Amino acid sequence: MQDAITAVINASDVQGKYLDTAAMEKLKAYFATGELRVRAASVISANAANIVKEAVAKSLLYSDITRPGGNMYTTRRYAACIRDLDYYLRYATYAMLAGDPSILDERVLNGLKETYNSLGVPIAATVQAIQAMKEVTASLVGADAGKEMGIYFDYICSGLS
Amino acid sequence: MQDAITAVINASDVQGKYLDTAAMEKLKAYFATGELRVRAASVISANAANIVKEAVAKSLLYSDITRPGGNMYTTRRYAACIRDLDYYLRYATYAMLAGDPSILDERVLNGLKETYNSLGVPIAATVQAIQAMKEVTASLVGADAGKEMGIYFDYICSGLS
Amino acid sequence: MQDAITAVINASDVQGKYLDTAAMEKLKAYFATGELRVRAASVISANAANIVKEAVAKSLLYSDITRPGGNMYTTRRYAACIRDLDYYLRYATYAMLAGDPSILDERVLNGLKETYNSLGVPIAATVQAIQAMKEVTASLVGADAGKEMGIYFDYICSGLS
Amino acid sequence: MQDAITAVINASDVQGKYLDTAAMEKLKAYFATGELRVRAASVISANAANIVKEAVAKSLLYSDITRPGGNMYTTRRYAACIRDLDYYLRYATYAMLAGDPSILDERVLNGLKETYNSLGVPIAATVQAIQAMKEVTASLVGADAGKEMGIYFDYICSGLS
Amino acid sequence: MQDAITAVINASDVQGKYLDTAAMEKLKAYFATGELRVRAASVISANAANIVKEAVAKSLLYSDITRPGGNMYTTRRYAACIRDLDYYLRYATYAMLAGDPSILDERVLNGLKETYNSLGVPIAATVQAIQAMKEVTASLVGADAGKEMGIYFDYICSGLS
Amino acid sequence: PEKEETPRFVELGAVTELRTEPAIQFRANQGVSKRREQTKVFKLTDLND
Amino acid sequence: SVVTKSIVNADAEARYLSPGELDRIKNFVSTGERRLRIAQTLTENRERIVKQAGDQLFQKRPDVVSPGGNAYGEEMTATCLRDLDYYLRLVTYGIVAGDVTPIEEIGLVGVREMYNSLGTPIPAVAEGIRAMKNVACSLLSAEDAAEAGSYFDFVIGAMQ
Amino acid sequence: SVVTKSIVNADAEARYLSPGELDRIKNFVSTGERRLRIAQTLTENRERIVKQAGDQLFQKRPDVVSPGGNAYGEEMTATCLRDLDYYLRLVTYGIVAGDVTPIEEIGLVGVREMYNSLGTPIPAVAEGIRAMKNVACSLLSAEDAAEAGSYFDFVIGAMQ
Amino acid sequence: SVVTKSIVNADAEARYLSPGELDRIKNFVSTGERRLRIAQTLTENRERIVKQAGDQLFQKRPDVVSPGGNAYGEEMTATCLRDLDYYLRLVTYGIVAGDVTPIEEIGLVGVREMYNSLGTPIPAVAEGIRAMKNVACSLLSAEDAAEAGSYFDFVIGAMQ
Amino acid sequence: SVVTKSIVNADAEARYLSPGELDRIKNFVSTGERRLRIAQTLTENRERIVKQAGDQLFQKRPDVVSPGGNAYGEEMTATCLRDLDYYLRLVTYGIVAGDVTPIEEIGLVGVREMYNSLGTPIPAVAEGIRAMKNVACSLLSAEDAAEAGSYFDFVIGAMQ
Amino acid sequence: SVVTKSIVNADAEARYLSPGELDRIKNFVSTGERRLRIAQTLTENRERIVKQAGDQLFQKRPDVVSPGGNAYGEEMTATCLRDLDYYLRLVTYGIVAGDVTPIEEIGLVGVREMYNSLGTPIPAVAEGIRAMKNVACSLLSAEDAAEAGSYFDFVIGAMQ
Ligand SMILES: *[C@H](C)[C@H]1/C(=C/c2[nH]c(/C=C3N=C(/C=C4\NC(=O)C(CC)=C4C)C(C)=C\3CCC(=O)O)c(CCC(=O)O)c2C)NC(=O)[C@@H]1C
Ligand SMILES: *[C@H](C)[C@H]1/C(=C/c2[nH]c(/C=C3N=C(/C=C4\NC(=O)C(CC)=C4C)C(C)=C\3CCC(=O)O)c(CCC(=O)O)c2C)NC(=O)[C@@H]1C
Ligand SMILES: *[C@H](C)[C@H]1/C(=C/c2[nH]c(/C=C3N=C(/C=C4\NC(=O)C(CC)=C4C)C(C)=C\3CCC(=O)O)c(CCC(=O)O)c2C)NC(=O)[C@@H]1C
Ligand SMILES: *[C@H](C)[C@H]1/C(=C/c2[nH]c(/C=C3N=C(/C=C4\NC(=O)C(CC)=C4C)C(C)=C\3CCC(=O)O)c(CCC(=O)O)c2C)NC(=O)[C@@H]1C
């Protein structure tokens, strides 16, 4: 796991130099946006169930995927699908709070492609679904916060793809 | 005439309850503060003439009220004023000892405003005199029992108002 | 067997010091409280039979325990049960007079657990009974002495349980 | 394990009552002393090894115990002795931070005397060593915090006895 | 500054109580020691210069410190070293007569360590020299006087290091 | 006057035994050991951390 | 109370409390803690006193509880025992207050009229209060029991 | 509480409290006075909160107090309100503790198992606690209300 | 202690404490402050009593400090002086307690066995304790000296 | 102490203690016992000495204790006696010290400013110290009075 | 950082950030100004902190710079001051981060292994960092010094 402060000080550490005024400026900028990041996290924490529900309904439901033989069919499969969407949204809010994509890159994305391909889970459908989550969560948090979140959602989409 | 002790027991009697823990706490408070009340009563008893004298001086003497055509003019009227001021002091001391303003209500204030309005006695000047006594007696008895006295002096002031 | 005084001097003896001023303060406190202890003992010694009677009636009677096959059924066992209750009350007042629970642990609760398990006596029913004794004896001796009898009764309860 | 706040609320919970005014008193007192506790913990966390070092030197070194045949002799047993002192100091700082000795009884002093007797460790010598620790740690933290550390070091001593 | 008598007087003033028996015997101990103190002080003044010479000869003379680049390898540096040693000796003789370390704390040991450090003069070298001076002084003064002079000089050496 | 009685729900959930320190010490620490919830469990969730 | 007694006597003569009056108040407030304790024992044991004294009254005066008597059946015996509880409560008020004025105002002025209207036998009521006095003495310590006994004695005298 | 959680987490790793934990407990210590104030308000208005929140709950769930419902009749409705009173008491404990550990252990481990044994509906208990949260927030200031409302929120979340 | 002795005897008799035994406990309680002061002056003058009495003992019994005696050698003499300090300590305990129970339990029971193994003559130990009694008597008033002297008397009698 | 004053002078002089200065220190050592005895007498007769002095001072200047005076009233008169007692204790300290060093740091530096702020009369305080000097001369030996009078006299001069 | 550590714990227990954790994140971000100011002071005075504290270390532990020691020679002493420079840099990083995980991640995991491989004395490194902390106290105001002191405390504590 890494964050904005950790990234700045890590870059300075690789440089072998004390915190420069430019590095302090980068830290100040992250501090400036940390306020908005906190309230966005609170909002989607409360509405996380609604967000997953809305995205699943928007793209996943009333389809051959959840119809028999579509791999989302079976109650266990449906629970696993919404569980993965919960995972993606929770890790997205962690990355949004941190201001860094490290958590997604290491905790989530690695090996996920291999497991999904081995199991037969449709990565295209997952990407579509988390795209729908991104739209819903942007509406709830607001525009500025949605910009902050959407990059991490797209990062996860690229990892799946 | 009803003390704080008689008030506590009478309230419990009205409710038909034995003296409970809360009312017994009230009684413990009164019993504890009784020593201060008693000593202050002795102080006011000894210095009654001085308290009245200083109050009459601080608020009433050398003014329209004492000059001819005012109420306190004529020795008759002046003697009546100092008599009534001592009555207000003596009953306030009774009330401090008891812990209840009921003695003031039943014996003093039971028509006082009507009597003063009938005779033409200035209610504002009487209030000023009683507040002057409040100051002087606070000095004599000390602040701790001065506050306890002050509530009953304020009671008389409010009634006459 | 120990007392409050004996415990204080024994602690100082273990350290090997003559009675320190802190030890003297403990001893002085016990002396100050001794009269209150003597009064409370005088009270419950007179009412010992009544305390046992009320506790038995409140918790042990008109239940299966004192009806055929209940461990208090049979006159021999009923006599034994009330005798144990007087045992508990007598040793509790010994401990109250001493100001130390060493009496209870050394005498009352040495293997009392084991005896009752062997005999088939219900530990829980005995604990309920002495709880009722605690309520009655606290009311008789008053609040401050009752909270002193209470701790010793609860110590007996804990040993049984 | 408990702390001052947990102990207060647990006692109130046992008696089935909302937090009393006396319970609120204890909570306030802990909060008033809490910042002092935190500062002291920081100090002896930094100097933990040094405190053990000084105490070992001041009572456990150049003595018959560390000479052959005295239990502390042998490098194994020396390492075990200093490790036990670090255990005692660390659990003392836990107890001081919590404001309750329940940690000491629950995790340190339960069975400790039995194990020490079986091992042959001198309970008297360990008590002397931790009293030396008490002096050193009191000097480092300060007088006020040193008192607080002492009431838990002495608790450990009494358990060892 | 302070004396033995003055310090006992200060403690009595802190307590707020007139001279106690304990105060009397503490003062009487100083009164008894006075003869030894004054005789030793005369001896110390008589052999003061010889004491300095003996101490440096025993400790730092004919060493690398005296040899080039040793912080004493100049005429000015050597004179300064002798001067500081004489300063410590004179204040220590004062303090020995006084019976209290307040004089040494107030004047001798105020910022001395920091100044020595920044200069680069070795604190350990000074401490060794002070101990050598203590040995010479004890020999000259006598056994009883040497014990007291040792205490005062020990304060100076410990404060320096 | 106002009757000022206690509500029934106060009485139903009120313990009327006047418990003291030995009883509270025992009745608060009754049950399975508190180290069932006062512990920690360690996992090798990420080899990289 | 005793504070009210002092203040009433002072008010009648239009004088600040005399030093003797104030002495009495100081004694009463100093003794208040023991007074409250005595009253508290009676209140805490309010059920024992009434129950045992009720049994003693019914033994000594069986006619009241017999059929055809005033307190026949549990419905009416409950009211009789309630009145015994009333007078215990008045006595506790009196112990706290330091005077018999609480007792006399609440429950002794016109007992003859009230009970003679209800048909109740007043001498039997007096026996009940005397039984309460004896039971209370068992509960209380001797020095304290003497003080509480005085208030019980005032009640029995009033109903004789 | 925060202090005991930090000590537990540190004891498992055998580490003296790191500065990261020490500042946490220092923060909790500093805000302790506000926490005690919130709890004091709740315990003062214990009876009002329970009474009117229970009335709201019965208004939103008439089936619960209707005949055949779990809390039907005088005593049964009083036990339902007693449970609400218990949860309010746990909430005050949690507020002063500064974490949800007392609430969790005392009353949310196996709450579903207990209520299903009783036959009580867990969602209706949740709505009762929601009504309590609304009333308690009305008795607190905005900052004080939102700090306590989270403990209420944890309780209702576990109820669901 | 008076309390422990009374309760021991009552335990054997299986009786709640007799009124007379309670009266003795009352009087012991009231006299406790005088006992504490007597013990206080003894411990304050601990040093003078030990050294003065020990020198008296050695004068009375030069054999013990002679070569071929038990205490010959400064170290052995010092440990005997310690024994005298021990017994004074036990006597102070006994004065506070009010009975010999602490004195006899802590020491003075297996006294002959211990001292026979040590080689000391126990009558010589008794002589030392007698000297301590004399010095303590001088340091006490006539009343106070009588109370402390009784405990010293028990100790010397048991030594013999 | 006198030694302390000599040490201060020596430290300013940057020289070891002068032979004559050491001689005065030797004299102070010799007079330690006599000075301690005089101080013990003053402390023993402390209450009576300052009681008589207070009566004499109030007689000399009745406006200190009269209405409108600084010490008018019992409490303020007791405070005035305390100030005198502070001075008496300082004089005893100074007699033990053998020098004005103890008093000067306590009650002789800025004392005029403090007394002016509170309102007490500095000349009347000085007279009170003089009354103490007379009482002390009465209660001490002739040469003891001379030395004690000298220390008292420095205090009186400081008040001026 | 505080943010990353809170996220890590929430990640482990599979919970979105709790409201209190969100408050802590917000607070740390807001006080970041003070954090940066403290770090700016330390980097402004990197030269004297290292130089003065290292000289104090050499004086306190002469054996490290003695012949046949780890720091003998100007080349080795330059590297030693370089190490102190590295640790001060880590401390400034930690102050900026608000947590000690950057300090631990960079320079406290395996210090014993590295320094023992080099032959350097680990306790001596700890004492040098203690010297840096003492130098820091003067440079930073009392309130500021406590904040930086905790990071210094972690470094020395891990070092020992
Ligand atoms: C039924 C008596 C109650 C009820 C149900 C309800 N369900 C849905 C939607 C879905 N239900 C399923 C269920 C299953 N999928 C499975 O694989 C299996 C096992 C073989 C089951 C049981 C699924 C997948 C859906 C999603 C839609 C879909 O099938 O694609 C709805 C519609 C919800 C909506 O608003 O979209 C409803 C209403 N509703 C009730 O009132 C009953 C109490
Ligand atoms: C003079 C012979 C003596 C004396 C008197 C003195 N009197 C006062 C104050 C007042 N005197 C009066 C008197 C009257 N009021 C009336 O209505 C009548 C009848 C018509 C009389 C005689 C009053 C009212 C006052 C109060 C002040 C005022 O008039 O408002 C003082 C002043 C006292 C003070 O400090 O208040 C004095 C000095 N003094 C002497 O030495 C003579 C022996
Ligand atoms: C003095 C502060 C002021 C004042 C008063 C004044 N009062 C009267 C006359 C009477 N006062 C009363 C009042 C009371 N009767 C009571 O029972 C009590 C409480 C115990 C009180 C206070 C009554 C009934 C009278 C009339 C009978 C009488 O004269 O006593 C007068 C005289 C008026 C007259 O016409 O004779 C005066 C002047 N006067 C002032 O100037 C002051 C401001
Ligand atoms: C009836 C002839 C007399 C009488 C008796 C009376 N007894 C009780 C209560 C109890 N009686 C027993 C008796 C026994 N327990 C046994 O194990 C045996 C041997 C098999 C016997 C005989 C017990 C245990 C009780 C306690 C209550 C209970 O059983 O739970 C009462 C009730 C007392 C009360 O007020 O509670 C009475 C009245 N009473 C008479 O008037 C007759 C002369």
Ligand SMILES: *[C@H](C)[C@H]1/C(=C/c2[nH]c(/C=C3N=C(/C=C4\NC(=O)C(CC)=C4C)C(C)=C\3CCC(=O)O)c(CCC(=O)O)c2C)NC(=O)[C@@H]1C
């Ligand atoms: C030696 C070549 C180096 C050195 C050592 C040094 N050691 C100590 C102190 C102690 N050493 C031991 C060692 C052992 N105890 C054991 O049981 C065993 C195995 C049988 C060993 C090896 C102990 C116990 C001590 C403590 C003192 C004591 O014995 O009581 C010191 C003294 C430390 C101090 O300041 O107190 C020293 C100096 N020192 C060197 O310079 C060498 C490189």
Ligand SMILES: *[C@H](C)[C@H]1/C(=C/c2[nH]c(/C=C3N=C(/C=C4\NC(=O)C(CC)=C4C)C(C)=C\3CCC(=O)O)c(CCC(=O)O)c2C)NC(=O)[C@@H]1C
């Ligand atoms: C040092 C002051 C004294 C001393 C100690 C010594 N202790 C042991 C062995 C053990 N000590 C413990 C104690 C604890 N275990 C814990 O987990 C905690 C904290 C919760 C404590 C306090 C235990 C369990 C052991 C045995 C297992 C082990 O070896 O760790 C020894 C070793 C004895 C042996 O020979 O096996 C020693 C020497 N020794 C001294 O001389 C000091 C007086």
Ligand SMILES: *[C@H](C)[C@H]1/C(=C/c2[nH]c(/C=C3N=C(/C=C4\NC(=O)C(CC)=C4C)C(C)=C\3CCC(=O)O)c(CCC(=O)O)c2C)NC(=O)[C@@H]1C
């Ligand atoms: C219910 C009638 C009474 C009661 C019980 C109670 N039990 C526990 C805890 C435990 N009980 C057992 C017993 C068994 N284990 C078994 O395998 C079997 C069947 C073969 C039994 C009967 C055990 C092992 C435990 C501890 C482990 C656990 O957590 O269950 C508790 C305490 C629970 C806790 O502390 O968290 C309680 C309260 N309590 C009552 O009031 C009834 C009288």
Ligand SMILES: CCC1=C(C)/C(=C/C2=NC(=C\c3[nH]c(/C=C4\NC(=O)[C@H](C)[C@H]4CC)c(C)c3CCC(=O)O)/C(CCC(=O)O)=C2C)NC1=O
């Ligand atoms: C860089 C400037 C500098 C100088 C010059 C210097 C001199 C110096 N001369 C010394 C000794 C000495 N110096 C003399 C000097 C003399 N005796 C005689 O008869 C002659 C007249 C005369 C020289 C011609 C003697 C005799 C000693 C030895 C003293 C002793 O220990 O007995 C010592 C003490 C011993 C030592 O070195 O540890 C120093 C330090 N130190 C310095 O730092």
Ligand SMILES: CCC1=C(C)/C(=C/C2=NC(=C\c3[nH]c(/C=C4\NC(=O)[C@H](C)[C@H]4CC)c(C)c3CCC(=O)O)/C(CCC(=O)O)=C2C)NC1=O
């Ligand atoms: C509070 C009383 C007080 C103290 C303690 C004090 C110490 C003091 N010592 C100093 C220097 C010094 N001190 C020494 C002393 C020594 N040389 C050695 O070899 C020994 C290890 C050691 C003592 C025996 C030396 C060599 C200097 C520097 C002299 C120079 O090079 O200019 C200086 C710098 C100014 C100077 O050069 O004199 C001060 C202020 N000054 C004071 O007012």
